Structures are given as structure tokens and as C-alpha cells.
Amino acid sequence: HDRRRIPLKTPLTMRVHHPVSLKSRPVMGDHATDVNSLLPDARLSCRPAAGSPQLGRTAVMR
Amino acid sequence: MKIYRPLWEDGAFLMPQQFQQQAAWDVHLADSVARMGLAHPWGVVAAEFDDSLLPLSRLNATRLIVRFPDGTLIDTERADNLPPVCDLSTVSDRSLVDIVLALPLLNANGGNLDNGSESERPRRWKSERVNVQELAGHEQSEVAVLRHNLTLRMAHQENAAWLTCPVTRLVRDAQGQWCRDPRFIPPLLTLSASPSLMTELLELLHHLQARRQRLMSMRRENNARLADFAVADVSLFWLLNALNSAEPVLKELLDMPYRHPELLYRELARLAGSLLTFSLEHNVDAVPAYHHETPENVFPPLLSLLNRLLE
Amino acid sequence: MKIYRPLWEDGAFLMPQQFQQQAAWDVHLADSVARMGLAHPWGVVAAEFDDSLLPLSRLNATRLIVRFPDGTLIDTERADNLPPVCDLSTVSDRSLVDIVLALPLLNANGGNLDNGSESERPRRWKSERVNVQELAGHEQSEVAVLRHNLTLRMAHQENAAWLTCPVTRLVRDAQGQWCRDPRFIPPLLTLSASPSLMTELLELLHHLQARRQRLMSMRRENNARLADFAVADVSLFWLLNALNSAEPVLKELLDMPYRHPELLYRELARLAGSLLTFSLEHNVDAVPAYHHETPENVFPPLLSLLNRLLE
Amino acid sequence: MKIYRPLWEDGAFLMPQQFQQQAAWDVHLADSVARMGLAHPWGVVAAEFDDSLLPLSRLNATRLIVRFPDGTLIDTERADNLPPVCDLSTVSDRSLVDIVLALPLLNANGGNLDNGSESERPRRWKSERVNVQELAGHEQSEVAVLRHNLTLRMAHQENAAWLTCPVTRLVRDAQGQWCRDPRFIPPLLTLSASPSLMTELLELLHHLQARRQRLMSMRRENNARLADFAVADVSLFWLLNALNSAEPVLKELLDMPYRHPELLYRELARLAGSLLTFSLEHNVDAVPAYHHETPENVFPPLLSLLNRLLE
């Protein structure tokens, strides 16, 4: 299992409704859940990234 | 039965045992606010009854304001409705009949609502389709509202899974028709809940002030002659001490008769100890100990004792 | 007003009247836990005004912490909005003027306000948007909040659907200049709301101990070997017995002036009653220490009495 | 500080800042009710320890119920935990060792404790998950509740935490045995939180009744001498009117050990102050004032005064 996050539901629905409302299971806040190196630096056009991380560049100690 | 403060997160699941364990904490807070000067299991304010059906064996309650030993306020003008009619044909006796008001005991571990026709006692009723106008300007709507499941009982049965708070007492008259006892005191919470006690206290006060005025009229303006002060006037100041230092407290308490009885006991038992040394040839402590939910053993003994000792 | 109570079960669902009635119920319990705060009605603990706006014939409030008879508590340091400017430029007749703090009566079929220009009945419940710090976290989100509708009115106008409580008078100084009354004890008191009385209570407490050391020292030659009776050696000891049991209690009702004054009525009245008998040839009986909306006729006559009667 | 009661109408999102503020306002109401009578930084209710482990210098708390000078009810029956004390011989003396209860200060931005982010300001909230059901039904589930953070620091370490409330005083016996002395008294909301004021009140009442019945028996010799008084009979009437008006209040205030001790102290002050004048050849008029921070500086000197003056 992976602790996923958002998918933002398109009506917020936690307006406390006067004319018609329902409870039994679906209650929440505004964001749900869904349970179900040696790399270089700032050079040009296309190969900066190690994808999302950027390390392997300032261990000058140990 | 513990009480848990619920935690209000954001982005979680709501469950009704956050609302219930929220709501049951404030009543327990108000209980411990109330138990800091006062020290008893509280009682009845303003019981009223109907008497028309009394040629038959039928009763009808009309207005109750009752508070139980767990801080549960029962109101019938705003909160709840009237408990139903009890039937008295199951008693042939002419003797004492004591009607208590009973509430089912609060649940421990699951199942407490009066849907389900199986024979179990601890219940709280559910009323629905109650049109409630919101205080915003809009229309009304059908909500569900908690109703307590009250009833009247007989106090000679077995009351093991209920609560007991006595209300009235019936004695059959000599012609067979039922009548209500004029001398019955439920466990009080405000002195305007039983008028005959107020009648006896009003009579006590005018009994008192004339005893004061005769003694004030027995004082001339010559406070010099000690010889006429050493015999016939050597206890009159002892008596005027006691009658002057306990009147304006008692008049204060009977101006606005809206307080708990412990205040009134703590004045009558103060005056009665002071007016016991003058005629101290009788029993040394006949003053009744206020340990009671039963004031019939309490206040008519004190008023009869003061009505003697003003002599 | 039929204060209902909601029922949360596994099928109950969310409405505004679910929460409004549960809000009102614990307000209503706060009166039912008062057995002395119902004896005297609801009070006033702080009310402070400005005088520099009076030559301009304006008037503006600074601090107002007032209990109202319906149970609603107002606090301009924990709620936020202060009442606006009371335009005095309609009073030509320069007699005295009284000032009340109004609050419009709750319509049980109308409601809150939306934009004001809708009806002819004045309404409570004004809205506001305040950035609120969420506790136990790191958010600052906007929540619509509640701030009451408070206006300062004169106590002579066409009274209408609003509660009242007075806060001050307006005397007219002989230069055509308004100012404030120096003697007006504010109505529905709760002790520390008016600072002028506390000074006179301090002076009374010291004036008691001024006489008491003299009455102590005049006895110190008697060697504690009395005769059986003497004409003053019983009238000496009453003025010790009436001070040595009301000094150490009245001392402790004066160090902490955060307390209802009804407890102070009963402790000055006993001291007055124990001294009316000590010297009387004029049929003078005590002032009535009853709570009222006008405490001008309870405490200042009692303070005039007790300075005189002690000597 | 600011408290923001929410507006309830048919627009708002279900934001968590409503419920925390609405629950925070009810504590302020329930404390303004409690300040109508008493005036107090709050005191303990029950504090009982276990003298089994004490040969190994580890102290534990079986039951604690206290309050705190901001009005925060702590129970160790619901909303409970407590860690023990690790070592005691870190202090090398007995008379200085005393244990306190500590609940850290309010951080006005942050909140609970969810990780190892140990700051210079501690937290006072936590989280926990337990099994909760109350509703219409029989099924239990799990929801997250809010539990306080308590610890047992000692008196002389620091005060960046709360403490301000002692609970005991550990001294050793000469054989290396730490044990609690009886002469320690916390600040008290109720009597019988300390088990050894009650014995030293019962011996007071027992010695009061004997020295009343003694002079009542003398008075039964003096019923031959009603109108024949002497210095013995006059001062006997003084002393008897001291004792008899004040016994029946004390028999009330020793069978309700659930009240605030102000009521006991106000009556014991009158009982002490009435009897000063009879042995003011031996003494002075020094009577101990009231001090709700260390009550052991008040009650045993007054109770040792009374047993001297009644003899």
C-alpha cells in the first residue's frame, strides 16, 4: 500500500446543506486520501536533471 | 463510562461518536461547576398535576422541571414532552401511594434507542418530522430530535434499572375518591416548588416580629437604673441580641424565594441554637440534622421547635 | 422558545439547526447552574467611557462587559465590535439624561442580518470575516464569525423590541457643558465595576479597627476578676462581642473584590442588627439590604448608618 | 485573548476552526459562572500514590484529579497517562524533596506533539487512538482523541513548564526509606483530598461537644439558680451562647466533605473570634488570614489556637 493524496473532488460538498443532505459514509475536509550519487549541475538545454533529485555535487569533505 | 475529548483534524473521516463524546463533556463540566458550593443530589422544580380523572384511577402530569443525580435536566416547556398516563386500578389499597418519576439508566456498552420491539428497558426515544425554523431567514425542515423516554412508577414495585425521584403522595379519601396529600415535600431545589412550606414560613415571620415588638415596647428610655435592670431586664438584652441579629437575613431569603434550601437551613439552625440556652432544661440537641432528601422529617420539626421557643 | 436537542445516529445528517440548538442548550444550562446569580438578576462588571468627546456633544464607549437577562454575555475584549457614536444633538432641555445599552429582541421567526435595508424590526446577529489561526496545526483560513448589534440609547425614547441595561447618567454643568455624574452607582452591580465604593469599604474597615483598639485598651485594667454584675460591665462586652465576630470575616470579603455583592448584604446586615439594640431610643430600624436595579438606596444609606451607629 | 464564536447559516464549509472556538467559549462561560461565588486559583481534588516501590526510589500516581489556574480540568480516569519518576537520590536530602504536577504553557501558534522536533517550548497536546461507541447500535470502531501531556518534575529544577501545584512531600526515614509525611497540604478545592485534615476536625468536634455538655451539666446545677446569676452564670451565658449557635453549622460542614473550604474557614473564624475576649489577658487579637496557595500556613495554627482557648 502507498499513502496517496489528492484527487480533488469537484464540488466541495461540505456546505452544511439545509434543503437536502446526506451523511452515512462520505464525509471529509477538502483533500481526500486513496489507499487503494555522482550528478552534475546547471548546464544547458537537456541533460541537467537527475529527474526530481539533484545531489552529488558538494560533498567536498568526507 | 469515560468521556473522551474528540480531536478535530482536517481531511479525515467524521463519525457520530465525535459529536456524542463532544456533547457529553460539557454536561460533566457543568456538574463540577455546580458541585463546588453545594453538596447534594438535586431534585424538583415546579411539579404540577391534573385532578379531573381522579374519580377514576387515572393521573395526568402537566409540567415538570426535574434534575437527576447525573446533571440530566428534564424540561417540559422547551426540551421534552409529557410522560403518559399511569393506571391505578392495579392497587385496591386505601393506604399510602407514592408516585416517583423514573428515567431509564444510561447505557454502558451498546444499544440505546427505542426502535426495536424486543423487551429491554434502557431507552431514549426518537422523534422525527419536526419542522424547525432556522434563525437565518429561511424556511423550516424535517430533523430528528432526541426525546427522553420518561414514565411514572409506583415506588412499591422493583426499581432496579431506573432512576428514582419522588413526586407526589396519594391517600384515598373516606368516600372512595382519590385525593392528593396537602403535606408532601419532594426533594427540593427551589422553595417555590411547594407552597405549604411557604405558608408556614410566612406565618413564622409574623410570629417572630410581634415577639420582637413586645420586647421593644418593654424598654423605657431610662437605661440608667441598674437595680431594675439586674432582674427584670437582665435577660431582655440577651433575647434582643438573638432576635435582632437573625431577622434581616431571614427576610432577605424570603423576599425572592428562588434559592436552594441549604441556605435556609444554615439560618434556621443558627437561630435555633441561639434560642436554646434560655430554656435549656429540655433536650440539649433536638435540632434535626439536614442529611436529607426527605424534608418532612426536617422542616416541620424546626418550625414546631421555633414556635415553642419564641415563648 | 422550544430549544430542541438533536440526535446523532448512523443515519442522521447535517443541518444548521443541528448545531444552533446545541449551541443554545449549553447557554441555557448556564442559568440553571446559578442559584445566586438568579437571585439577583444578570449584572454589569465593567463599563468605562470617554469625556473628551463631550464638548463636541458626542459619546463613545471603550469597554463593556455586561450580562443581559436572557443569558447572553457581551464582552468587548473577547468579542470585538464596539457600539458607535451616540449623537446627543437632539436634547435641548438640559435636565439630567440616562443612558442604556440596548440589544434587539430575538425574533423566533426572523433571524440574522443580510444587508439591513429590509424590514422595520431591528435585528441582532451581524456577520464578519476574520482570519482564524487553527490550533494544533499551521493554517490561517477565513471563518465567518458572530458579532452582536449594540447601540447606546437614552432611557426615555420609544422603547421597542430590545432589551436594556443602563450604564451612566448625564448631568449638565452650569457652563452649558455636559459631564458625568459622580454619585451614580451603575445598576445591576457586580462588585468591582464601580471603584468608588471599594474605597469607602476600605475606610469603613479601618474605622472599625480605630474604635476596636480603644475598646480593647479601656478594659485592660480590669485584671479579669469581675463582679457578678455591673451597669456598664455588661454593656461594655456587647460592643466587643459584636465586633470580634464580624471583623475577620468582613476583612476577607474585602481583599478580593471579584464576587457577587449579595454575599456582602448579609454580612453587613448582621453587624447592623447586632448594634441597633446596642443604642436605640428612636425606633430606627435597618435599611433593607435587598438586591435591586437601583443600588443607590442600599449601600450608601447602610454606610451612613454604620459610621454613626458604631459611636 | 480573542475568542471567535462562529456564525451558523446555510453557506459555510465544514472548517475545523469553528468547533475549537465554539468549544473554547463554553469553558469561559462555565468559569464566569464559577466566579460568581468563590475567588480562587483552582486546587487539587484527589492525589493518591503507592508506597510499595519507594525502597527503590520510584514514585507513581494511581489517581489524580486536579484543576489549573486557567480552568483546565485534568482527570486521570478519562484523558489519562503519567510517566513515573526515575531516580530520587539525585537529591541528597529529605526535607527538600517534593513532587509537583506540570502541564506545559500554551503556544499561541503551533500545537500538539507529533514527532521528535524538541524545541525550547514544549507542547501540551498529543494524539491517541482508542475504541469508542455510544450510539444507537452495538458496533465499536476507532477514532482519534486528544490527551494531555503530564509529567512529575520536582520543585527546584525549572519553571518553563507549568508546575504551580504541589501534590506531596517525600521525606526519608533513617533506614533509607522515603515516605510521605502527614503534615502536607496542597491547595484544596474540596476537603478529604487531604486525609489528615478530617481526623483533626473530628477531634475538634469531639472536644467541642464535651466542653459543651460539661457546662450544660453545670447549667443543670444552675437551674436552681436561673434568676440568681453570678459572674460564673453571666460569663457562662456568654460562653454558652458562643458555643450553641455554632455547633449545628459545624455538624453540617463535616458531613459534606465535597465543598470548597472557604465555607469551613468563614465559620471557624467566627468561632475563634467569639472566644478571644475571654483570654485576651493571655493573648492578642492575631487571627490567621486566608491563603489559598499554601493552606498549611493557615489551618493547623488556627486549630491549635482553638484547642488552647477551649481549655
Coordinates of N, CA and C in Angstrom, one line a residue, chain C residues 18-135:
Chain C
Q18 N -29.1 21.6 13.5 CA -28.4 20.6 14.3 C -27.5 21.3 15.3
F19 N -26.8 22.4 14.8 CA -25.7 23.0 15.6 C -26.3 24.2 16.4
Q20 N -27.3 24.9 15.8 CA -27.8 26.1 16.5 C -28.5 25.8 17.8
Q21 N -29.2 24.7 17.9 CA -29.9 24.3 19.1 C -29.0 23.8 20.2
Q22 N -28.0 23.0 19.7 CA -26.9 22.5 20.6 C -26.1 23.7 21.2
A23 N -26.0 24.7 20.4 CA -25.3 26.0 20.9 C -26.2 26.6 22.0
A24 N -27.5 26.7 21.7 CA -28.4 27.4 22.7 C -28.6 26.6 24.0
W25 N -28.5 25.3 23.9 CA -28.8 24.4 25.1 C -27.7 24.7 26.2
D26 N -26.5 24.8 25.8 CA -25.5 25.0 26.9 C -25.4 26.4 27.3
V27 N -25.9 27.4 26.6 CA -26.2 28.7 27.1 C -27.3 28.6 28.1
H28 N -28.3 27.9 27.9 CA -29.5 27.8 28.8 C -29.1 27.0 30.1
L29 N -28.1 26.1 30.0 CA -27.7 25.5 31.3 C -26.9 26.4 32.2
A30 N -26.3 27.5 31.7 CA -25.6 28.4 32.5 C -26.4 29.2 33.4
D31 N -27.7 29.4 33.2 CA -28.6 30.0 34.1 C -29.1 29.0 35.2
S32 N -29.3 27.7 34.7 CA -29.7 26.7 35.6 C -28.7 26.3 36.6
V33 N -27.4 26.6 36.4 CA -26.4 26.3 37.4 C -26.1 27.5 38.3
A34 N -26.9 28.6 38.2 CA -26.8 29.7 39.1 C -28.0 29.7 40.1
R35 N -27.7 29.7 41.4 CA -28.7 29.7 42.4 C -28.6 30.9 43.3
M36 N -27.6 31.8 43.0 CA -27.5 33.1 43.5 C -27.5 34.2 42.4
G37 N -27.0 33.8 41.2 CA -27.0 34.7 40.0 C -28.3 34.7 39.3
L38 N -29.3 33.9 39.7 CA -30.7 34.0 39.5 C -31.4 34.7 40.6
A39 N -30.8 34.8 41.8 CA -31.4 35.5 42.9 C -31.4 37.0 42.6
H40 N -30.3 37.6 42.6 CA -30.2 38.9 41.9 C -30.1 38.5 40.4
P41 N -30.7 39.3 39.5 CA -30.6 39.1 38.1 C -29.2 39.4 37.5
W42 N -29.2 39.4 36.2 CA -27.9 39.5 35.5 C -27.3 40.8 35.6
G43 N -26.0 40.9 35.6 CA -25.2 42.1 36.1 C -24.3 42.8 35.1
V44 N -23.4 43.7 35.7 CA -22.5 44.5 34.9 C -21.2 44.5 35.6
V45 N -20.1 44.2 35.0 CA -18.8 44.0 35.6 C -17.8 45.1 35.2
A46 N -18.0 45.8 34.1 CA -17.1 46.8 33.6 C -17.8 47.7 32.6
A47 N -17.6 49.0 32.8 CA -18.2 50.0 31.9 C -17.5 51.3 32.0
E48 N -16.7 51.6 31.0 CA -15.8 52.8 31.0 C -16.0 53.7 29.8
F49 N -16.1 55.0 30.0 CA -16.4 55.9 29.0 C -15.4 57.0 28.8
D50 N -15.5 57.8 27.8 CA -14.6 58.9 27.5 C -15.3 60.2 27.7
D51 N -14.5 61.2 28.2 CA -15.1 62.5 28.5 C -14.7 63.6 27.5
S52 N -13.6 63.4 26.7 CA -13.1 64.4 25.8 C -14.1 64.6 24.6
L53 N -14.9 63.6 24.3 CA -15.9 63.8 23.2 C -17.1 64.5 23.7
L54 N -17.3 64.9 24.9 CA -18.4 65.6 25.4 C -18.5 67.0 25.0
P55 N -17.5 67.8 25.0 CA -17.6 69.2 24.4 C -18.1 69.2 23.0
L56 N -17.8 68.2 22.2 CA -18.4 68.1 20.9 C -19.8 67.5 20.9
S57 N -20.3 67.2 22.1 CA -21.6 66.5 22.2 C -21.7 65.2 21.5
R58 N -20.6 64.5 21.5 CA -20.6 63.1 21.1 C -20.4 62.2 22.4
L59 N -20.4 60.9 22.2 CA -20.2 60.0 23.3 C -19.8 58.6 22.7
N60 N -18.7 58.0 23.3 CA -18.2 56.8 22.7 C -17.8 55.9 23.8
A61 N -18.0 54.6 23.7 CA -17.7 53.6 24.7 C -16.2 53.1 24.5
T62 N -15.7 52.5 25.5 CA -14.4 51.9 25.5 C -14.4 50.4 25.8
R63 N -14.9 50.1 27.0 CA -15.0 48.7 27.5 C -16.4 48.5 28.0
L64 N -17.0 47.3 27.7 CA -18.3 47.0 28.1 C -18.4 45.5 28.3
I65 N -18.5 45.0 29.5 CA -18.7 43.6 29.8 C -19.9 43.4 30.6
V66 N -21.1 43.2 29.9 CA -22.4 43.3 30.5 C -23.1 41.9 30.4
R67 N -23.6 41.4 31.5 CA -24.6 40.3 31.4 C -26.0 40.9 31.2
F68 N -26.7 40.3 30.3 CA -28.1 40.6 29.9 C -29.1 39.5 30.5
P69 N -30.3 39.9 30.7 CA -31.2 39.0 31.4 C -31.6 37.7 30.7
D70 N -31.3 37.7 29.4 CA -31.6 36.5 28.6 C -30.5 35.4 28.7
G71 N -29.4 35.7 29.3 CA -28.3 34.8 29.4 C -27.2 35.2 28.5
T72 N -27.3 36.2 27.6 CA -26.3 36.5 26.6 C -25.2 37.4 27.3
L73 N -24.0 36.9 27.1 CA -22.9 37.7 27.7 C -22.1 38.5 26.6
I74 N -21.9 39.7 26.9 CA -21.3 40.7 25.9 C -19.9 41.0 26.5
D75 N -18.9 41.1 25.7 CA -17.5 41.3 26.1 C -16.8 42.0 25.0
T76 N -16.5 43.3 25.1 CA -15.8 44.0 24.0 C -14.3 43.8 24.1
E77 N -13.8 42.9 24.8 CA -12.4 42.5 24.7 C -12.2 41.0 24.3
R78 N -13.3 40.3 24.1 CA -13.3 39.0 23.6 C -14.2 38.7 22.4
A79 N -15.3 39.5 22.4 CA -15.9 39.9 21.1 C -15.2 41.2 20.7
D80 N -15.5 41.7 19.6 CA -14.6 42.8 19.1 C -15.3 44.1 18.8
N81 N -16.5 44.1 18.3 CA -17.1 45.4 17.9 C -17.7 46.1 19.1
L82 N -17.4 47.4 19.0 CA -17.9 48.4 20.0 C -19.1 49.2 19.4
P83 N -19.9 49.7 20.3 CA -21.1 50.4 19.7 C -20.7 51.8 19.2
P84 N -21.3 52.2 18.1 CA -21.0 53.5 17.5 C -21.4 54.7 18.3
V85 N -21.2 55.9 17.7 CA -21.3 57.2 18.4 C -22.7 57.5 18.7
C86 N -23.0 57.9 19.9 CA -24.3 58.3 20.4 C -24.5 59.8 20.1
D87 N -25.3 60.2 19.1 CA -25.4 61.6 18.7 C -26.3 62.3 19.7
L88 N -25.8 63.1 20.5 CA -26.5 63.9 21.5 C -27.2 65.1 21.0
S89 N -27.1 65.4 19.7 CA -27.6 66.7 19.3 C -29.1 66.7 19.0
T90 N -29.9 66.2 19.9 CA -31.4 66.3 19.9 C -31.9 66.7 21.2
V91 N -31.1 66.7 22.2 CA -31.6 67.0 23.6 C -31.4 68.5 23.8
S92 N -32.5 69.3 23.8 CA -32.4 70.7 24.1 C -32.6 71.0 25.6
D93 N -33.5 70.3 26.2 CA -33.8 70.5 27.6 C -32.7 69.9 28.5
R94 N -32.0 70.8 29.2 CA -30.7 70.5 29.8 C -30.9 69.9 31.2
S95 N -32.0 69.1 31.4 CA -32.0 68.3 32.7 C -31.1 67.1 32.5
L96 N -31.3 66.2 33.5 CA -30.4 65.0 33.5 C -30.9 64.0 32.5
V97 N -30.0 63.2 32.0 CA -30.2 62.2 30.9 C -29.6 60.9 31.3
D98 N -30.3 59.8 31.2 CA -29.8 58.5 31.5 C -29.5 57.7 30.2
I99 N -28.5 56.8 30.2 CA -28.0 56.1 29.0 C -28.1 54.6 29.3
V100 N -28.8 53.9 28.3 CA -28.9 52.4 28.4 C -28.2 51.8 27.2
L101 N -27.8 50.6 27.4 CA -27.1 49.8 26.3 C -28.1 48.8 25.8
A102 N -28.7 49.1 24.6 CA -29.8 48.3 24.1 C -29.2 47.0 23.4
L103 N -30.1 46.1 23.1 CA -29.8 44.9 22.3 C -31.2 44.4 21.8
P104 N -31.3 44.3 20.5 CA -32.7 43.9 19.9 C -33.1 42.5 20.3
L105 N -34.4 42.4 20.5 CA -35.0 41.1 21.0 C -35.0 40.1 19.8
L106 N -34.8 38.9 20.2 CA -34.6 37.8 19.3 C -36.0 37.4 18.7
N107 N -36.2 37.6 17.4 CA -37.3 37.2 16.7 C -37.1 35.7 16.5
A108 N -38.1 34.9 16.9 CA -38.1 33.4 16.7 C -38.7 33.0 15.3
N109 N -38.8 34.0 14.4 CA -39.2 33.6 13.0 C -38.4 34.5 12.0
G110 N -37.7 35.5 12.4 CA -36.9 36.3 11.5 C -35.5 35.6 11.5
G111 N -34.5 36.4 11.9 CA -33.2 35.8 12.1 C -32.0 36.8 12.1
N112 N -31.0 36.5 11.3 CA -29.8 37.3 11.2 C -30.0 38.5 10.4
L113 N -28.9 39.2 10.0 CA -29.0 40.3 9.1 C -28.4 39.9 7.8
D114 N -28.8 40.4 6.7 CA -28.2 40.3 5.4 C -27.6 41.6 4.9
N115 N -28.5 42.7 4.8 CA -28.0 44.0 4.4 C -28.7 45.1 5.1
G116 N -29.6 44.8 6.1 CA -30.1 45.9 6.9 C -31.3 46.6 6.4
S117 N -31.3 46.9 5.1 CA -32.4 47.7 4.5 C -33.5 46.7 4.0
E118 N -34.1 46.0 4.9 CA -35.2 45.0 4.6 C -36.5 45.2 5.3
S119 N -36.4 45.5 6.6 CA -37.7 45.5 7.4 C -37.7 46.7 8.3
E120 N -38.7 46.7 9.2 CA -38.8 47.8 10.2 C -38.6 47.3 11.6
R121 N -38.2 46.0 11.8 CA -37.9 45.5 13.1 C -36.4 45.3 13.2
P122 N -35.8 45.9 14.2 CA -34.3 45.8 14.4 C -33.9 44.5 14.8
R123 N -32.7 44.1 14.3 CA -32.2 42.7 14.3 C -30.8 42.6 14.8
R124 N -30.6 41.5 15.5 CA -29.2 41.1 16.0 C -28.4 40.5 14.9
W125 N -27.3 39.8 15.3 CA -26.6 38.8 14.5 C -25.9 39.4 13.3
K126 N -24.9 40.3 13.4 CA -24.2 40.8 12.3 C -23.0 39.9 12.0
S127 N -22.6 39.8 10.7 CA -21.6 38.9 10.2 C -20.3 39.7 10.0
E128 N -19.2 38.9 9.7 CA -17.9 39.4 9.7 C -17.0 38.3 9.2
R129 N -15.9 38.7 8.6 CA -14.9 37.7 8.1 C -13.6 37.9 8.7
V130 N -13.1 37.0 9.6 CA -11.9 37.1 10.4 C -11.0 35.9 10.0
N131 N -9.7 36.2 9.8 CA -8.7 35.2 9.6 C -8.4 34.5 10.9
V132 N -8.6 33.2 11.0 CA -8.6 32.5 12.2 C -7.4 31.5 12.2
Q133 N -6.6 31.6 13.3 CA -5.5 30.6 13.4 C -6.0 29.3 13.9
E134 N -5.9 28.3 13.1 CA -6.2 26.9 13.5 C -5.2 26.4 14.5
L135 N -5.7 25.9 15.7 CA -4.8 25.4 16.7 C -4.4 24.0 16.2

